[PDB]
Amino acid sequence: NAMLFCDDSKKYLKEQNINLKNEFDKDDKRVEKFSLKHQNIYFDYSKNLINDYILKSLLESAEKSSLKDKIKQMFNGAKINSTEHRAVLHTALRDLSSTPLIVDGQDIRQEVTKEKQRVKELVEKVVSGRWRGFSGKKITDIVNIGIGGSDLGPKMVVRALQPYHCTDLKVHFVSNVDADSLLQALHVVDPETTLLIIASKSFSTEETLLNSISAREWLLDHYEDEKAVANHFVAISSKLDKVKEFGIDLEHCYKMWDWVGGRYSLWSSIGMSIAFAIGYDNFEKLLAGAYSVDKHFKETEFSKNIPVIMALLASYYSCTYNSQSQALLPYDERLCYFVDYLQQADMESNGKSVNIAGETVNYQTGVVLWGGVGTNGQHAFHQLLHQGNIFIPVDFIAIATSHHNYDNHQQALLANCFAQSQALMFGQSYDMVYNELLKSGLNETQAKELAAHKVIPGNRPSTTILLDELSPYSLGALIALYEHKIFVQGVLWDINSYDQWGVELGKKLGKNILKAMNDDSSDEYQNLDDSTRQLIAKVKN
Amino acid sequence: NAMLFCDDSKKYLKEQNINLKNEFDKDDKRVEKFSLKHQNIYFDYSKNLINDYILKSLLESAEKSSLKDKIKQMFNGAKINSTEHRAVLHTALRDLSSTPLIVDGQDIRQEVTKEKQRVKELVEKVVSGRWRGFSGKKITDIVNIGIGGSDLGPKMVVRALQPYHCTDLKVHFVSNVDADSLLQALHVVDPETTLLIIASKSFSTEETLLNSISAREWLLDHYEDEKAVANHFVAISSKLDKVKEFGIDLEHCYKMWDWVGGRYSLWSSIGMSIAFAIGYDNFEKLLAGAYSVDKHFKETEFSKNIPVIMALLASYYSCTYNSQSQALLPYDERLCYFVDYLQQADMESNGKSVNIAGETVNYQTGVVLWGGVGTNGQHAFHQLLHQGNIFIPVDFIAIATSHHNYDNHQQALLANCFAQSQALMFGQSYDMVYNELLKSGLNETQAKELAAHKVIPGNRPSTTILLDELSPYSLGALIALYEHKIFVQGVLWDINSYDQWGVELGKKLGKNILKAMNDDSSDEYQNLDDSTRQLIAKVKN
Ligand SMILES: O=C(O)[C@H](O)[C@@H](O)[C@H](O)[C@H](O)COP(=O)(O)O
Ligand SMILES: O=C(O)[C@H](O)[C@@H](O)[C@H](O)[C@H](O)COP(=O)(O)O
Ligand SMILES: [Ca+2]
Ligand SMILES: [Ca+2]
16 A cells, blocks of 8 residues: 555656756756755756656655655664565664664664774784784785675775775785686785685675685695684674684674675675775775765755655656666766666665565566766767667766866866766757758758768756765765665665565575586486576586 | 568567467477577577567568678678768778778778788787887886777777786776876886877877877876887877877877777777787787678578577567667676677667668667676676566676686586576566475465565576687677677668767867866856856866
């Protein structure tokens, strides 16, 4: 009996036939109406296909929904992950409010704070040289072993905050079971000077098991002494009994909890590799930036609430325009893993076909998230954004000031960002193009033959999110805005954003195929479909 | 008057209601019918939503189209890029047939061969130490400066063929105008031991101008002598008069031609950075692998022609299912830039709204290409591939043998690849899930509450392309298959795959915004829409 977001009313808001050029021409308050600020982030949604009536309608849907209650439930530790019967408490990992919070018997404030202090102490001990390897040498390299939620957030943040690296440690990320991943690290690190991190909430993920066993074999090939594991491995898990079983003791184990989703885990002990690159102080700033956004989201009326507006725009488009993707365009090299990161956070959350009650939904839910760094994308897929015939909402991320003094480069980067959103909005008409071709020296026959191919239809929507700089704090705020957008969309679709029963299945598949690959007389091999069977046959011969 | 590909007939082939499980159960020739081989590439399209009637219908469309003629025209140098009045001759860059080919007065065989010999000589001179820097030191580092087509192919191939690196040179890629790109290279290279490559077909691209000027300033800050440019820069262009104007002489300029599209240019002198990593012999093998596929495509009847089948499947889905994206899943770390590369090749080619005649088309053309490396994607967006409600065709790329002896890792990587396609095909029904939950120890109430959330609908399509290994040759074959797929789709849609009037516009935009940013009294500033104006105001203050 939840409110239906994608209803007949939405399908018909589109009939307003918004013309963005006309709106900016006629409404001198357009930017004031359709932009928001949060500290030093400027959120400009004014190039979206909305006017007051459409935004009002969308906000009414949010107000009529369970969203207000669901926000409170999330922060209070209610078990909103209803299919796994878990709280959803990534927010608590970065809390600065210190309000009381007791969940399933645990003082969450105390638990979070104590574990941070343990990570901070480990980083300090390693960076200061108090932690030595088994042969007594100072550590110079950190290798994180993990996949998915135990890999991509730390990897993305370490890159994004490269200018802030300050520990004299090189941090490497091993993830894929493809041994190329492990080898890229092992080829450049020395067993006597490397600390290995086994990052795994479950401690039973195939890839991370195989990679950790292989890394341990490499370490022990060198030292020929099992006692060396103590100086060269730590673990991060919710499953401490399983860590001990691998050979790492509790004093070398760092906790996370069931209420930390992998794709929302960089804020937890899983982020230790981030601290090892940028120092713990900068890791605290990353968390504080997210807290600022958490407070904004929790406390702000929906009409002025950035994540809510992000979510309403996105779901409006995917409902009313039947779009099946969204483009995210970060105009900063440091954000080269940001699309990949959000692709996981978004699609793994909201790629769901049933509602909370288990009913198959008759409306589309999460769509594909993709994109690429600017300005490079302008040379590639922006062609399709300008002249294809696919409706695609676009977010640009711009950073006002960079980390260097090549001011001409930075000005050009921003000019291009703003030009691209402007060009999506205006396009270029046949008449404009034709007259420009004549002015360039083409005769009338030539200009008539070419002009239609240069028409850019325009009236295509975009949002621009402008940060003052890309610091630990502003990056943390930026990620948190999208975390909450994803949450709001899930609420409005009445799905569970926090389970992943397709990912869970993936972790159990192909034990059967491995068995088949190793014995063609097995039941497993006999029961194969023939496509799988002939693929296996081809990798044998 | 071209044949309409997306017609009523296609929309109705879907009514066959293909059930993949049922097809494999009942048809013991399914794999034989719906797979092809080209040398050591196996193309298995049998998990697609086709049967004989659907494939026949699609092949009839190809046979009825202009495709047969268009293939001949492409290879013969006809001006199939009709809006720029250019030939489309990336094929000629890798030719081994030596058949006569004269285009716009040039012997293309002689031109291509002579330029290869020049690149080969440069690489040999640099690697042998015959080429010295201005202070007499051997070169140790190569920096390619270029963007889009002058960046991404070389960058992707250099990574993909990392195991084959053999010149003792480190190759770096500078592209974005964001000065972070240039700085990542300059921070790790020495002016006295670095050769800089200015890669630009036009020699007038904003980003590459600014990056090249900045690199030259860095070089000259060190040497304080303009004569040093001679030992530290080469250029690749179709516009040799513009190179001279920058200060590089003709003997240091390497040619490409107007008939080499940027996004099809790695095969040309633009690929020099690839040769500088892997040696010229391996670069020749890359080209030979593409030639093998060119010969396949040119000579093979459509029913057995891999690129044609790829194109027909893709366009069938995007027509009949109204899908707006395709997923590409490379199960090898070395292919980490492959999706990005093909995203450019595909979307920039086929993101077009008008046909060859300039008429606005009433059918959808190119769709979004996205994806990610396996197995990592299984932990992230595969959730949406399994349980979302978006129809998305999927290609998997598998490599039978890797470059190391971690055979357990490689077997697991392949098992996972094949398991994922198998799981897309079969899914898991309510009954299967429910009975598994009971067997795990849940009672009936608990199993009923959870089961619907674990249902995986299945009957989702995939193709698997299996290579024997990822070598220069097999990579070249792989890229060429997709080049030709894109070509075939464009033909069937009656669009020009080879222009990019949205990218061309991008290169001219925001001169106006830069002018506005530098003078708020300008006409440019006054004429701004207010969203752009307030964004500029915010990056001032
Ligand atoms: O939260 C998520 O997005 C997923 O559950 C998944 O990506 C998970 O993080 C990995 O499978 C690693 O799991 P472990 O941390 O348990 O090894
Ligand atoms: O072919 C392409 O895909 C595009 O035309 C574009 O990506 C182009 O390669 C770049 O804009 C660099 O152009 P230059 O090589 O002329 O600098
Ligand atoms: Ca209400
Ligand atoms: Ca025919």
